C-alpha cells in the first residue's frame, strides 16, 4: 500500500477534497493558492513561500549575505507550470521513499496521528480548535470548508536551498513547546541538494577517488519531518537553548549557532554533545507538560465548534498522548508509556537512523560542512529509483555509493554558483607584512564550558527500594496502526485567518574581518602557503614558507630536497616520460613513509611529514616532530587544551530500619548497584567531554592533512602540464602523455597515505582519552568508593555479617572496567580502543623509559622526573640506569597530585630489571639498604637489598611490617643471579596475599591482610640509602608500575615482551656486540673451557677443565669464568652501522691465540657427519666454510651459531663432539635436528671482580 494514492499530476480540476484552492493563515489578505492534499492532514502547495512571512515578500538576494556556508538565490524558480509539476512529482516520490522504510513508516504514521490539541477556549471546561491551525479550501460552488491539517509543504523562500520548518504561534501559549502542538509548514525543494565531501570511506572501498558526494534529498526531507514531529507534540526545545562556543581566539569559528533541537534531531554522534543532566531536565519538563494537558483534558466536559461527539475527541487525544483512563473517565499519565513515547520521538526518530536504514552517505557530524549546490532531477526513474535512490542496483552506481559521487555520476548533478563567497566571512591572521584571510568555515570548533553541567557533587540517600536495528524492529512490531484520526467537520471560520508566525529570537551579526597579530606561523599560514593560481608562468616548489607566501609563483612543499630539485629541472622530450614516472615514484615514496620507533604506547604508526605539513608545535623538522610527539604525548596536536574537572562525588546516606532482616540486605544491594551506576555515569560524562572538546580538533587536522596532500598533488600536476605545454607539435604527438591516468595514480597514492594518517590520528585521540582524561575521573570514583566502603562496614555493625562483609570488600576492592563500546558507536575508533586495551603496558600507571635523550613517564601520570647529577646511563643502551652509593646519585619521581588517590597501593604490581654486582667487602653482610622508596610518615612500600637477598617491605602507620624476600646464594659454581640481569616483579593484593616472582616464576608469597592503614605517598626514590659499603652500585631498567594485581600469564607475557629476543645477549644479559672479545662457555659442560691446539689446518680446538676457583673466605666461592681463548665477532653482511648484533645476522668468528687473531674455519669435505673446527691465519683460503649465522630464536634458546657453506648449504650448528679422548669442537648437523649447541659469551666486566691473568 503506497503512501500517496492516485497521483495528482498538476492541472487536474479544483474538485475540493484532494486538489483545491486553499487559503493558509497569513498576516493580512492573500489570494487563494492551489494546493493538493497527498494524504490525511498533509497538503503540498507547489508555490514559493511568500505568504506566511510578510517580510519575505521579495525573491532577490539580500545585500547582506547570511552566515551560511552555501546558499543559492533565484527568482524564476517554480514560476512555470512544468516546474510546479516537477516539484510535485519529486515531493510525492520522496514521501513514498520515506514511507517504504520501516522507520519512515513509523514516522509518517506518528505525524499523521498527532493532531494539534484543542486549546482555544478561554473557559477551562471547554475544548476549541486554534484558529491558526486550520485552512480554508474553497469549493467550486463558492463557499469554503474550514479544515484542520497537520503538515504543509511549500517551495522555498528567497533562499532556494534553505530548508526550515515554520509554525504559527499564539498570543499567550507556546504551542510548539508546551505539548499542545501546532501545524508545521515545511519549506522544502527536491530539485536542489547540498553537496559534501567524505574522507572516511576508504576503509571499505580503497579504489574510490576524490570525495564530492551529493546529499540524498530523502534524508533532508526526513530531517524536516523529524522537526515537524517534534513540534507537533509540543516537545521542541526552546530556541534560546543554544550550544554556545568561544570566538575570541584566532583559531575559533567567528559564529556558529546550533540549537539543542538540531542536536536532538541529528542524533548519533551529535546527540552525545548534550550531557545526561540536561536530557533529564527536558524529560521531566515535558512529562510535567503532558501531565498538565492530561489534567486539562480530564477537567473539561463540553466541546464547542464541531458536530463530532466529545468522547471521540477524548479518545483521539488519549491515543495521541498514550494517556491511561481507568474506566471512570479519569485520564492520567503513566511513566512507562510516556518514557517509551518520548524515547521514540527523540532517540528513535533521528537522521542517523534514517541514514542507516537508507544505506546512503551523509556527514557523520554537523561539523562536516556543505560545500556546493547541486541541481538534480528526481522525477525520472532512470536517475532516482523509489527503493534505492541514486544508488541504483545492477549498475556501476550500485557499489561503493557511486550513485552519490558527482565525479562518477556527473550527468545527474549540475554544480551551481553559490552566493556566499569563499572569503565573505573570514578572519585576517598575520604575524608581526604578510596577512592572509582564512574562511570562517575553516577554523576549529571550541565549545564553551557552560554547556556541560554535573549533578555529581549533590549527595544521595538510599532507602529500602531505590531504583541498534533490532530495537527499532521491536518498536515496529510493538507500534500501533490502523487507527488514524478520521476527518472531522469543522464549522467554517472567517475568510481571512489572522495569525503571526512563531516569534524567533534575534541573532546578532558576528563581526567580520577581525585582524589578529601573532608571533608564529600558524597551520593556516602553512596551508595557504601551498596554494597557487594555475598561472601561465612556471611554478617551482620550495621549502621556505617565508618566500612561498611572498612570491605568488613559488609554492611551499614539505617533501625532501631531492624532490623539489627534480620537479624544478628543465627536461627535454626524450627524458620527459621517464621524468614523470620518477616523479610519481618519489611521490609514493615520500607519502608512504612511516616511523620505526615503536617503544611508544600505541602511537606505533607515527607519520613524520605531519610536522612540517602544519607546523605542529612550532618546529619545522620531522625528526623534531617525532621527538616532541614522544616527549609530550598527543597534546601537541591539540590547538587548545580542554579543561576537565570532576567535582568531589557526593556521599551515600544510608537509612537504618529498626529490627529488620530483609530490608537491610536490600539497602546493601542498592548501595552496590548505585555505586555501579555512579561509575557508569562519570565514565559517560568524561566520554561526552572528550568527544565534544578533543575529537573535533583531530578531525579538523585530518581534513587539513587531506587538503595539503591534494594541494601538493595539484602543484606537481600543474608543473608537469606546464612542462609538457612547451614542446613542439611533433614532440607532443611522438611523445604522448595524458593527464587522467596521472591524476588517478596520484589520487591512489594520496589515499594510501591517508589510511596511515587516519590510523595515526585515531591512535592519538584514543591515547589522549585514556591518558589525560580518564584518570582524573578514576581518582574521584575510587576515592568515593573508599569513602562508601567505611560507611557500609559501619552499617553492617543481623546474623549474616560475614557474607555481607566479604561481598562489600570484594565488590569495592576492585574497579569497573572502562569499555568504550557502551558509549560510542564508531567502529573505526572502537577497533583502535580494543588495540589499546590489548597491550598490558598501555594500562600501566608509571612507565619510566628513556626516549629521545630524556627519561620520561610514557604513561603521563608523573609530574616531575628529577634526575641527580651522578646517575649514569649506558651509552650502548641508554635504558639501563646505573645508580651509585652517593648522596647525589638519585632519581625522584613526583606524581601528579590530581591523579593520585588516597586508597591506592591496595592492589598493585611493580616490575623492573635489576643487575646486582657481586658482594666483595665483608661489611655487606647483614646490611639492608633501600634501593626504591615510596614511604612517607613511616608508611608504604620499599624495595631493599641485602647480601644475596632482594626484599620487598610493606609497612603501615601502626608500625606493622610484612616482608617478602628472595634469597640467592653466592657460594655456587655458576650463578644465574650474580651480576646478571634478573626480572623482579611484585604483586600485592590487600585481600589475600603479596607475592614476588623472579624471572616470571613464583618465588615467594605472604599474607598482608593483617596490615592496617598503609597511607599512600607521592614521591618515588631511586637511591641507595643506608648502605655501609662505599663502592656499592646497582643497574636498574624498565621500571613499571600497575594499578591491579597481575596473574602468572601477564607476568610471563611481560617477561617475554621486555626480554627483547631480537638481540643476542652475552653472559651478563647485556647486548652482544661486534668487535669485542668474549670468553666462551658451554652450557652442556660448564666445567670446562675452550682451548686451541696448534693453530692451522692440522690443529683444532677442544674443551679442557676444570675452570678453576675464585674465592674470598666467608664471602663467596665461584668458578672462574675468564678462561680460555677469546672469541670476537667481525661483521660480514650487516648493513646496520651500529655494532649491535641481531638475530639471523651472518658473522665471522675470530679466535685469539697469543694475541693474534685466527679465522674460525673448517673443511667440510672430511668423511663423517662431524666437521671438526679449526683456526686458520686470516690470509687463508676462502674455499673453507667460515661464515657463521647467529640465531637466538627457534621460543628462545640462548645464543647459537650455525656454520654455513659458501654456497648457502648449512654445515650445521656449532658444538662439541667427544671425537676420541679429546673433546673437539665440531659443526654438526645432528644439533640441527632438535644440547651442546648453546653457548654463553662472557665479557670482562667490572662487577665480577676476577682478574684476567
Amino acid at each position: 500500500s503506497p503512501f500517496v494514492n492516485k497521483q495528482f499530476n498538476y492541472k487536474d480540476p479544483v474538485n475540493g477534497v484532494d486538489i483545491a484552492y486553499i487559503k493558509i493563515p497569513n498576516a493580512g489578505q492573500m489570494q487563494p493558492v492551489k494546493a493538493f492534499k497527498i494524504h490525511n492532514k498533509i497538503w503540498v502547495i507547489p508555490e514559493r513561500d511568500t505568504f506566511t512571512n510578510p517580510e519575505e515578500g521579495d525573491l532577490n538576494p539580500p545585500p547582506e549575505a547570511k552566515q551560511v556556508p552555501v546558499s543559492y538565490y533565484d527568482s524564476t524558480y517554480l514560476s512555470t507550470d512544468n516546474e510546479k509539476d516537477n516539484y510535485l512529482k519529486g515531493v510525492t516520490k520522496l514521501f513514498e521513499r520515506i514511507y517504504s522504510t520501516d522507520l519512515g513508516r513509523m514516522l509518517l504514521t506518528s505525524i499523521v496521528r498527532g493532531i494539534p490539541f484543542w486549546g482555544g477556549s478561554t473557559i477551562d471546561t471547554e475544548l476549541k480548535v486554534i484558529d491558526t491551525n486550520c485552512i480554508n479550501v474553497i469549493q467550486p460552488d463558492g463557499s469554503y470548508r474550514s479544515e484542520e491539517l497537520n503538515l504543509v509543504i511549500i517551495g522555498p523562500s528567497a533562499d532556494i536551498i534553505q530548508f526550515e520548518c515554520k509554525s504559527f504561534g499564539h498570543e499567550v501559549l507556546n504551542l510548539t513547546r508546551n505539548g499542545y502542538g501546532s501545524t508545521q509548514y515545511i519549506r522544502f525543494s527536491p530539485d536542489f541538494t547540498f553537496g559534501f565531501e567524505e574522507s572516511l570511506e576508504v576503509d571499505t572501498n580503497p579504489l574510490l577517488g576524490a570525495g564530492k558526494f551529493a546529499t540524498d534529498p530523502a534524508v533532508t526531507l526526513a530531517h524536516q519531518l523529524i522537526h515537524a514531529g517534534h513540534r507537533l507534540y509540543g516537545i521542541a526545545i526552546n530556541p534560546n537553548r543554544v550550544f554556545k562556543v568561544n570566538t575570541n581566539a584566532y583559531y575559533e569559528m567567528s559564529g556558529l549557532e546550533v540549537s539543542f533541537e538540531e542536536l536532538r534531531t541529528f542524533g548519533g554522534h551529535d546527540a552525545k554533545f548534550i550531557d545526561s543532566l540536561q536530557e533529564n531536565e527536558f524529560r521531566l519538563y515535558y512529562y510535567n507538560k503532558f501531565k498538565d494537558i492530561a489534567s486539562t483534558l480530564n477537567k473539561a466536559k463540553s466541546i464547542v465548534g464541531t458536530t463530532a461527539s466529545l468522547q471521540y475527541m477524548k479518545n483521539v487525544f488519549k491515543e495521541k498522548y498514550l494517556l491511561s483512563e481507568d474506566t471512570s473517565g479519569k485520564f492520567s499519565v503513566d511513566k512507562l508509556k510516556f518514557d517509551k513515547l518520548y524515547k521514540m520521538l527523540t532517540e528513535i526518530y533521528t537522521e542517523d537512523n534514517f541514514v542507516k536504514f537508507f544505506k546512503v552517505l551523509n556527514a557523520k557530524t554537523f561539523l562536516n560542512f556543505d560545500k556546493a549546490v547541486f541541481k538534480i532531477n528526481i522525477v525520472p526513474k532512470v536517475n532516482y529509483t523509489i527503493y534505492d535512490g541514486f544508488n541504483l542496483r545492477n549498475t556501476n552506481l550500485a557499489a561503493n555509493f557511486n550513485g552519490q559521487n558527482t565525479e562518477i555520476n556527473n550527468m545527474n548533478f549540475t554544480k551551481l554558483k553559490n552566493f556566499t563567497g569563499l572569503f565573505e566571512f573570514y578572519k585576517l591572521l598575520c604575524v608581526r607584512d604578510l596577512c592572509i584571510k582564512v574562511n570562517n568555515w575553516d577554523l576549529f570548533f571550541s565549545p564553551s564550558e557552560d554547556n556541560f553541567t554535573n549533578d555529581l557533587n549533590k549527595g544521595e540517600e538510599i532507602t529500602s527500594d531505590t531504583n541498534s536495528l533490532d530495537l527499532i524492529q521491536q518498536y515496529y512490531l510493538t507500534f500501533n496502526f490502523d487507527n488514524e484520526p478520521e476527518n472531522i467537520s469543522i464549522e467554517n471560520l472567517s475568510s481571512d485567518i489572522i495569525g503571526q508566525l512563531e516569534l524567533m529570537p534575534n541573532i546578532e551579526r558576528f563581526p567580520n574581518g577581525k585582524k589578529y597579530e601573532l608571533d608564529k606561523y600558524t597551520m593556516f599560514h602553512y596551508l595557504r602557503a601551498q596554494e597557487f593560481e594555475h598561472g601561465k608562468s612556471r611554478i617551482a616548489l620550495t621549502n621556505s614558507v617565508n618566500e612561498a607566501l611572498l612570491n605568488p609563483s613559488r609554492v611551499y612543499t614539505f617533501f625532501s630536497s631531492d624532490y623539489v630539485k627534480k620537479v624544478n629541472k628543465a627536461t627535454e622530450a626524450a627524458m620527459f616520460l621517464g621524468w614523470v614516472e620518477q616523479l610519481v615514484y618519489d611521490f609514493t615514496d615520500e607519502t608512504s613513509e612511516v616511523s620505526t620507533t615503536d617503544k611508544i604506547a600505541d602511537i606505533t604508526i607515527i607519520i613524520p611529514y605531519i610536522g612540517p605539513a602544519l607546523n605542529i608545535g612550532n618546529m619545522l623538522y620531522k625528526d623534531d616532530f617525532v621527538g616532541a610527539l614522544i616527549f609530550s604525548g598527543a597534546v601537541i596536536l591539540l590547538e587548545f587544551i580542554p579543561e576537565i574537572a570532576i567535582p568531589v562525588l557526593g556521599t551515600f546516606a544510608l537509612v537504618s530500619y529498626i529490627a529488620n532482616k530483609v530490608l537491610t540486605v536490600q539497602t546493601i544491594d542498592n548501595a552496590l548497584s548505585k555505586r555501579n551506576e555512579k561509575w557508569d555515569e562519570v565514565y559517560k560524562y568524561i566520554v561526552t567531554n572528550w568527544l565534544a572538546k578533543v575529537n573535533t580538533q583531530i578531525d579538523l587536522i585530518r581534513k587539513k592533512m587531506k587538503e595539503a596532500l591534494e594541494n601538493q598533488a595539484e602543484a606537481t600536476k600543474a608543473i608537469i602540464n606546464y612542462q609538457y605545454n612547451q614542446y613542439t607539435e611533433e614532440e607532443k604527438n611522438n611523445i604522448n602523455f595524458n593527464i587522467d591516468d596521472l591524476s588517478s595514480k596520484l589520487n591512489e597514492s594520496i589515499n594510501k597515505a591517508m589510511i596511515n594518517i587516519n590510523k595515526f590520528l585515531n591512535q592519538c585521540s584514543v591515547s589522549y582519552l585514556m591518558n589525560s582524561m580518564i584518570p582524573y575521573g578514576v581518582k574521584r570514583l575510587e576515592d568515593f568508593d573508599a569513602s562508601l566502603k567505611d560507611a557500609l562496614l559501619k552499617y553492617i555493625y543481623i546474623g549474616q555479617v560475614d557474607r555481607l562483609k566479604d561481598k562489600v570488600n570484594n565488590t569495592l576492592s576492585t574497579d569497573i572496567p572502562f569499555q568504550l563500546s557502551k558509549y560510542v558507536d564508531n567502529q573505526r575508533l572502537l577497533s583502535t580502543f580494543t588495540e589499546y586495551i590489548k597491550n598490558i603496558i598501555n594500562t600501566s600507571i608509571l612507565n619510566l623509559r628513556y626516549e629521545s635523550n630524556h627519561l620520561i613517564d610514557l604513561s603521563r601520570y608523573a609530574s616531575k622526573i628529577n634526575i641527580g647529577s651522578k646517575v649514569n646511563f649506558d651509552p650502548i643502551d641508554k635504558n639501563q640506569i646505573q645508580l651509585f652509593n652517593l648522596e647525589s646519585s638519585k632519581i625522584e619521581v613526583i606524581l601528579k597530585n590530581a591523579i593520585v588517590y588516597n586508597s591506592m597501593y591496595e592492589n598493585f604490581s611493580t616490575s623492573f630489571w635489576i643487575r646486582i654486582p657481586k658482594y666483595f667487602n665483608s661489611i655487606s653482610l647483614n646490611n639492608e639498604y633501600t634501593i626504591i622508596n615510596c614511604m612517607e610518615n613511616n608508611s608504604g612500600w620499599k624495595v631493599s637489598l641485602n647480601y644475596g637477598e632482594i626484599i620487598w617491605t610493606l609497612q603501615d602507620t601502626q608500625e606493622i611490617k610484612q616482608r617478602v624476600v628472595f634469597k640467592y646464594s653466592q657460594m655456587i659454581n655458576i650463578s644465574d643471579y650474580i651480576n646478571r640481569w634478573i626480572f623482579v616483579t611484585i604483586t600485592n593484593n590487600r585481600l589475600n596475599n603479596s607475592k614476588i616472582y623472579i624471572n616470571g616464576r613464583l618465588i615467594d608469597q605472604k599474607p598482608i591482610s593483617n596490615l592496617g592503614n598503609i597511607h599512600a605517598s607521592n614521591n618515588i626514590m631511586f637511591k641507595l640509602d643506608g648502605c655501609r659499603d662505599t663502592h656499592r652500585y646497582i643497574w636498574i631498567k624498565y621500571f613499571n608500575l600497575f594499578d591491579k594485581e597481575l596473574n602468572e600469564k601477564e607476568i610471563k607475557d611481560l617477561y617475554d615482551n621486555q626480554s627483547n629476543s631480537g638481540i643476542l645477549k652475552d653472559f651478563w644479559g647485556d647486548y652482544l656486540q661486534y668487535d669485542k672479545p668474549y670468553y666462551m662457555l658451554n652450557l652442556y659442560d660448564p666445567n670446562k673451557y675452550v682451548d686451541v691446539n696448534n693453530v692451522g689446518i692440522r690443529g683444532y680446538m677442544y674443551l679442557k677443565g676444570p675452570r678453576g676457583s675464585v674465592m674470598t673466605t666467608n664471602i663467596y666461592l665461584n668458578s672462574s669464568l675468564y678462561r680460555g681463548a677469546k672469541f670476537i665477532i667481525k661483521k660480514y653482511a650487516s648493513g646496520n652501522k651500529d655494532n649491535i648484533v641481531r638475530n639471523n645476522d651472518r658473522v665471522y668468528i675470530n679466535v685469539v691465540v697469543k694475541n693474534k687473531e685466527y679465522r674460525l674455519a673448517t673443511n667440510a669435505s672430511q668423511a663423517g657427519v662431524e666437521k671438526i673446527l679449526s683456526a686458520l691465519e686470516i690470509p687463508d683460503v676462502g674455499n673453507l666454510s667460515q661464515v657463521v649465522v647467529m640465531k637466538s630464536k627457534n621460543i628462545t634458546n640462548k645464543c647459537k651459531m650455525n656454520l654455513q657453506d659458501n654456497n648457502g648449504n648449512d654445515i650445521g650448528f656449532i658444538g662439541f663432539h667427544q671425537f676420541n679422548n679429546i673433546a673437539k669442537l665440531v659443526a654438526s648437523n645432528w644439533y640441527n635436528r632438535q644440547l651442546g649447541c648453546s653457548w654463553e659469551f662472557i665479557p670482562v666486566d667490572d662487577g665480577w671482580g676476577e682478574r684476567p691473568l
Partner: protein, 547 residues
C-alpha cells in the same frame, strides 16, 4: 728303635740327604721371606706416599696371629697324619694364596690374602725340622740341622735384597686410585712366592718320613724307602680330638717341666730378637730425623719485596712474614711452615709441596696456577680477592729423597751379620753341647745389649745391630736342635708347632713394644731386652741333657 737307628747309621750321609736338605732349606727360605714381608714390607706399605715423611703402623701384623694358628693347626696335625702330606698342603696353600694376593685390587682383600698365606706358612718350620730330623745320622745330627738354619736367615737377606730393588717407595699399600702401573708391589708379591714354588716343584720327588711311616705301619714301605736311601748313598760314595689330646700329652703329662722350660726360652728369644730387629731401623730413622730437625730455621718479621724464587727452600718456619709481590715458579717446598704470614699478589706456578702447611695466613690477590697446594694444606686461612686455577693432579714428592731404602739395607746387613756367627755354631754343637751353647749365646747377646746404651750414631747403631745378630744365631740353632731332639716321633711335630706358635706370639709382642718406644726413651727397651735375654739364658740351663 735300635734297629732303625742302626740301619740309619749304616746308610750314612750322602747325595740324598743333601738334596733333601736343599729342598727343605727352600721352605725355610719361604718362612724367612714371610717374616720379612710381614715385619718390614706391610708396616711400610700402610705409609702415606704423599707425606714425604711418615710414621710406622702395624695393621698387617695380624697375619702374625694367623701364623700362630697355622703353627698349631698345620703343626700338630702332621704328627697324626703325615709330614710330607702336611708340608705339601701347607706350602701349596701358601703359594696359591700369595699368587692370588698378587692379583688383588684394594688393601682389605690383599691383607686377607696375606693373612691366609700366613696361616699356610706358619706351619712349615715345625714340619720341615721334624721331617729332616728323621733322616740324618744320629751322631752327625747337630751339625746338619744347624746348617738348615742358615737358609732361614738367607731368606730374609734375599727378601731384603730384592725388596729395595723393586719397591723402594712407601705408601704402595693404602693407594688403589692409581693407574694399573705402579704395580711394583704386584711383581714383588709375585716374586716373593718363588722359593715356595720351587719347593713345591721339588717335593714331588722326595719320599715320606721313614720313622713316621714305620710308626704308623706298613713296614715294607719303610724298608723300601730305606733301601732306596741306601742305594742312593752307595752310588754316590761308590681326629681333632686325638690331636688335641696329643697336644695335652705334650704339656700336662710326663713331658711337663721340659716343655715349660722350652716355651719360656722360645718366648724370651722370639721377644728380644724380633723386637730389636725392628727397633734398630726405627732408631736409625729417628736419629736421622733428629739430625734433620736440629737444622730448623726460624724466620721472624720478613719483608720480601719483588723476589722471584727459583730454587728449593726446605726445613724453615716463617712467622709474621709479609710476602709482598713475590713469585714462586717451578720449585719444591719441603718441610716448610707458614704462620701469620700476609701474602700480597704473589704468584705460584709449578710449585710442588711436601709436608708444608699454611696457618693463620692472610692470602690476598694471589694466583695458584698449576700447583698441588690443595685445600687441606691451608688451615684457618683467610683468602682475599684470590684465585685457584689449574691444579696439578695428585700429590708429588721427591721420591729420590723419599726412599726408605735404608730400612731395607739395614735389614739386609742385620740378616747378613749372622752368617759368620752361624758356621762357628754349626761345627761346634758336637763339642760344647746343646745346653751350654744356648745359655752362653743368650748371655753374651745380653752383655752386648747392655753396651748399646753407650752408642749413639749411625755407624754405632749398625755395628751394635751386627754384633747382636751375630751372637744371637747360635742360640736359635741350639734351640731348634734341643727342641727337635727331646720329644719322640709321636709328639715331635705337635710340640714343635706349639713352640713355634709361642715364638710368633713373642714376635708380635716385641715388634709392637719395641717399635712403639721410639723417641720417648732408650734405656727402657734396652733394659727390658737385656732382662729377657738374661732370664732366658739363666733358665735354659735347667734343661735335660741330650748328648
Amino acid at each position: 728303635a735300635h734297629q732303625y737307628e742302626t740301619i740309619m747309621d749304616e746308610c750314612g750321609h750322602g747325595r740324598f740327604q743333601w738334596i733333601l736338605f736343599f729342598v727343605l732349606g727352600l721352605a725355610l727360605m719361604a718362612d724367612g721371606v714371610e717374616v720379612f714381608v710381614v715385619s718390614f714390607a706391610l708396616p711400610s706399605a700402610e705409609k702415606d706416599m704423599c707425606l714425604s715423611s711418615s710414621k710406622k703402623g702395624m695393621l698387617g701384623m695380624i697375619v702374625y696371629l694367623g701364623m700362630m694358628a697355622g703353627a698349631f693347626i698345620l703343626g700338630g696335625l702332621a704328627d697324626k697324619l703325615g709330614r710330607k702330606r702336611v708340608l705339601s698342603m701347607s706350602l701349596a696353600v701358601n703359594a696359591s694364596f700369595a699368587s692370588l694376593s698378587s692379583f688383588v685390587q684394594g688393601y682389605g682383600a690383599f691383607l686377607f690374602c696375606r693373612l691366609i698365606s700366613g696361616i699356610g706358612i706358619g706351619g712349615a718350620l715345625p714340619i720341615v725340622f721334624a721331617y729332616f730330623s728323621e733322616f740324618l745320622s744320629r751322631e752327625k745330627r747337630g751339625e746338619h740341622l744347624s746348617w738348615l738354619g742358615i737358609f732361614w736367615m738367607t731368606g730374609g737377606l734375599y727378601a731384603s735384597a730384592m725388596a729395595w730393588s723393586i719397591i723402594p717407595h712407601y705408601g704402595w699399600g693404602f693407594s688403589m686410585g692409581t693407574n694399573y702401573h705402579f704395580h711394583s708391589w704386584r711383581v714383588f708379591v709375585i716374586v716373593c712366592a718363588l722359593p715356595c714354588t720351587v719347593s713345591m716343584v721339588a717335593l714331588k720327588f722326595m719320599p715320606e718320613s721313614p720313622r713316621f711311616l714305620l710308626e704308623m705301619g706298613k713296614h715294607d714301605e719303610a724298608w723300601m724307602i730305606l733301601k732306596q736311601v741306601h742305594d742312593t748313598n752307595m752310588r754316590a760314595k761308590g681326629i681333632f680330638k686325638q690331636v688335641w689330646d696329643n697336644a695335652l700329652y705334650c704339656v700336662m703329662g710326663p713331658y711337663r717341666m721340659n716343655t715349660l722350660i722350652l716355651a719360656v726360652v722360645w718366648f724370651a728369644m722370639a721377644f728380644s730378637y724380633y723386637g730389636l730387629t725392628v727397633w734398630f731401623p726405627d732408631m736409625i730413622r729417628y736419629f736421622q730425623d733428629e739430625e734433620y730437625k736440629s737444622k730448623m730455621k726460624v724466620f721472624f718479621g720478613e719483608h720480601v719485596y719483588g723476589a722471584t724464587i727459583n730454587f728449593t727452600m726446605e726445613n724453615q718456619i716463617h712467622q709474621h712474614g709479609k710476602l709482598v709481590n713475590d713469585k714462586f715458579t717451578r720449585m719444591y717446598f719441603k718441610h716448610v711452615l707458614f704462620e701469620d704470614t700476609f701474602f700480597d699478589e704473589c704468584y705460584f706456578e709449578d710449585v710442588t709441596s711436601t709436608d708444608t702447611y699454611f696457618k693463620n695466613c692472610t692470602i690476598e690477590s694471589t694466583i695458584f696456577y698449576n700447583t698441588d697446594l690443595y685445600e687441606h694444606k691451608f688451615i684457618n686461612c683467610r683468602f682475599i680477592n684470590s684465585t685457584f686455577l689449574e691444579q696439578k693432579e695428585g700429590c708429588h714428592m721427591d721420591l729420590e729423597q723419599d726412599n726408605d731404602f735404608l730400612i731395607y739395607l739395614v735389614s739386609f746387613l742385620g740378616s747378613l751379620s749372622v752368617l759368620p756367627g752361624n758356621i762357628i755354631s754349626a761345627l761346634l754343637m758336637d763339642r760344647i753341647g746343646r745346653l751350654k751353647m744356648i745359655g752362653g749365646s743368650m748371655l753374651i747377646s745380653a752383655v752386648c745389649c747392655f753396651f748399646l746404651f753407650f752408642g749413639n750414631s749411625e755407624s754405632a747403631m749398625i755395628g751394635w745391630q751386627c754384633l747382636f745378630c751375630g751372637t744371637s744365631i747360635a742360640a736359635w740353632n741350639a734351640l731348634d736342635v734341643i727342641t727337635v731332639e727331646l720329644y719322640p716321633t709321636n709328639q715331635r711335630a705337635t710340640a714343635f708347632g706349639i713352640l713355634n706358635g709361642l715364638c710368633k706370639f713373642g714376635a708380635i709382642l716385641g715388634n709392637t713394644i719395641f717399635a712403639s718406644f721410639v723417641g720417648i726413651t732408650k734405656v727402657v727397651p734396652i733394659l727390658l731386652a737385656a732382662a729377657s735375654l738374661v732370664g732366658g739364658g739363666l733358665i735354659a740351663l735347667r734343661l735335660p741333657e741330650t748328648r
